[PDB]
Write a protein that binds this ligand. Sequence first.
Ligand SMILES: *[C@@H]1O[C@H](CO)[C@@H](O)[C@H](O)[C@H]1NC(C)=O
Ligand SMILES: *[C@@H]1O[C@H](CO)[C@@H](O)[C@H](O)[C@H]1NC(C)=O
Ligand SMILES: *[C@@H]1O[C@H](CO)[C@@H](O)[C@H](O)[C@H]1NC(C)=O
Ligand SMILES: *[C@@H]1O[C@H](CO)[C@@H](O)[C@H](O)[C@H]1NC(C)=O
Lengths: 509, 102
Amino acid sequence: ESCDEMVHADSKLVSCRQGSGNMKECVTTGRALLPAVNPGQEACLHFTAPGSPDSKCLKIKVKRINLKCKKSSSYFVPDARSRCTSVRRCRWAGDCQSGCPPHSTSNSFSDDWAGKMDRAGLGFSGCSDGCGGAACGCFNAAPSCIFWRKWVENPHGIIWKVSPCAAWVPSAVIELTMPSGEVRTFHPMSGIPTQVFKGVSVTYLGSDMEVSGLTDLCEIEELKSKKLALAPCNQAGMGVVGKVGEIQCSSEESARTIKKDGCIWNADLVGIELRVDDAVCYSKITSVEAVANYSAIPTTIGGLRFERSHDSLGKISGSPLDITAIRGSFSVNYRGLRLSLSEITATCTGEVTNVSGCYSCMTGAKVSIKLHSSKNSTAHVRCKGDETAFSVLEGVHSYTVSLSFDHAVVDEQCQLNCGGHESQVTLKGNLIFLDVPKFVDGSYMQTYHSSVPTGANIPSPTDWLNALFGNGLSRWILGVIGVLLGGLALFFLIMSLFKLGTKQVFRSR
Amino acid sequence: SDMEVSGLTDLCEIEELKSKKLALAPCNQAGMGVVGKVGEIQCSSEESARTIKKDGCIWNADLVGIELRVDDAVCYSKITSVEAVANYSAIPTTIGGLRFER
Ligand SMILES: *[C@@H]1O[C@H](CO)[C@@H](O)[C@H](O)[C@H]1NC(C)=O
Ligand SMILES: *[C@@H]1O[C@H](CO)[C@@H](O)[C@H](O)[C@H]1NC(C)=O
Ligand SMILES: *[C@@H]1O[C@H](CO)[C@@H](O)[C@H](O)[C@H]1NC(C)=O
Ligand SMILES: *[C@@H]1O[C@H](CO)[C@@H](O)[C@H](O)[C@H]1NC(C)=O
C-alpha cells in the first residue's frame, strides 16, 4: 500500500567497488529511527547511493498492538493420582528385633517392590511397625516390620503449559519485508532483542502503561483441549504448597511420566494412612479449577477485555477503549545486508488518474498513479505537505497510493520523478471530511487505537457557505444581494403575520 | 463454590477406636510442635502405637518431670488427657449455623 515517514538517515555511506563487473554493492550500515504509525500502515526506509540515482526501500507493516507479558520461565505441571502398596511379613529372625531402621536406613526395598520401573514416578520410602498375635499374622507379641511405598501416576496424560509473568509490557507484531524479496514476521518486545535477522534489529518502545488490578496473573494454557484460563500461578522451584505449583518436571515429553531426574517436588504432597496392614493413600493435589480468582477465556477484569488472539508465541491479549497513547516510535539498527542497484534507469513518465479520500484524517486521501517504464522498480515521489514512496513493476500497470493533504479543494502541482528522470503531475478533485467514529453496542476493540485528528474542530468559511447555492466566478455579489433581498422579504412577511395575529388576538375577545 | 465458615479456624476430627467416640477439639500440627495442648508423644501407626518404643515414636523435650530429695528420684505426671484442653466438643455439635453430626 502507501508509505510515509521517510528518514534518509545514512545516505551516501558506502565504500563499494566496480561491483562484480557492471554494478553491485557490498554493505550499508548506520542507524535510523521510525516514528509511530497507525495500525495498518507502512514505514518505508529509502536508501540513497552517490553513484546510483535511486535505490529500494524497506517497508514495516504493523497489524495489531496487544498487551502481552514477557516469558520469565516455562514448565509443565502434569496431573497426578494416588497409588500405594504394602506387604505384611514376620520377624522370624534377628532382622526385626526392635525396629525396622536401626539409625538411618531409608532404603526400604528388599529387591521386591515395584519401584524399579519407568512408569512408577516420584515417591517416598517410608516404613512402620506391626502388631503381634494370631490375628496380626505372626507368633510373637512384638512389633513386626511392615514396609509401605506410595507414588503418583498419570493414566490420562493431560499436559498444562504455565508461564509466570508479572511485567505486562506493550508489544506489537511486525511484518518486515527485506529489499531482496524475503518477507517474514516476528514479535518485538519493549526493550528485549527480537532475534535480529540479517542485521535488522528493529525494536518497539512503549509508554509504561499502568494496570488496574493486574498483580498476580499468569498465562496457563492447555494443550489437548486448547483451553485457556487466567489464574495466579506459582514461582520458580522454591515454592509453597497450597495453590497452583504442584509437581512439575523438565520438559513436555517428560511430563507424561512422573519419573525422577527432571521432576521436582519439595515435600508433603501425598499422605499415608493405615490402621491394620492396609496402607491406604488419600489424594491431596488440587486441580487447576480449585484455587480462587480462576477466570476463563473471556475476561473483563477492569477496563481491559482479555480476549484470545490467534497468534504464534502468545495466546493472551486484550484491548480497552480508545487510549490514544503518547508515542510508539521504533528503533532500527543495521549490522550487515546487501542490496543490488541497477543504475541503468531510462526515461519514465507518469500521470494522475483519480483522487479521493477523507480530509486530514486517519485513512487519508488515496491517489491512483499510473506509470510506464522498462525498469522493475525505480521511483521516488516528493512533494510539499507529504512524501510518499512506493514500488512499481515492469511495463504499464496501475497503482494506488495515499497522501496527507490539509485542504478540501486539492488543486496543486506536485513533482514526480522515477529513477533519474523527472516530470510534473497535477491533482484535481473534491474531498470530504470524516471525524472520529463513535462507539456502538455489541462491538469490542481488538488491538488498540493509535490517534485521532481533533485539532481544528472549527467550521471553515471557505469550504462552508459555498455549496448551498453554488460558485461561478463573479456572481458572489449577486448571490449575496439575492440572499439579502430574500431575507428582507421573509422578515417583512413574518412581521406582517405577527401583526395580523396580534390584531386578531387583541380584538374580538 | 468455596463456602466460607463462621468460626471454623482450628478444628480437627480426632476419633476413638475402641469405644468409637468422636469429638471436635483443636489439635496440634506435624512433628515440630509446642507442648501445652494436644499433641503429646505420637508414633508411626496404630499397630505401632501399642508400644512407646523408638523407631516411629517422636517426642521433642520436657514431657515428664523428675524430683528427688534423698535417693528417691520420684516422677510426677504432667501429660493431660484428651478431655483437658479448651473448646472440647462432643458428637453432637452446633457451633454456629452448622450442626456437626456423625
Ligand atoms: C483474589 O483477588 C482478590 C482481589 O484482587 C484478592 O483480595 C485475593 O487475595 C485473591 N485471592 C488469592 C488466593 O490470591
Ligand atoms: C479511476 O476512475 C474511477 C474513479 O473513482 C475509478 O472507479 C476507476 O476504478 C479508476 N480507474 C481504474 C483503471 O482503476
Ligand atoms: C524484475 O522482475 C521480474 C519478475 O518479477 C524478474 O524476473 C526480474 O529478474 C526482475 N529484474 C530485476 C532487475 O530485478
Ligand atoms: C476457644 O475458642 C474461642 C472462640 O473461638 C477462642 O477465643 C479461644 O482462644 C479458643 N481456645 C483455645 C485454647 O484455642
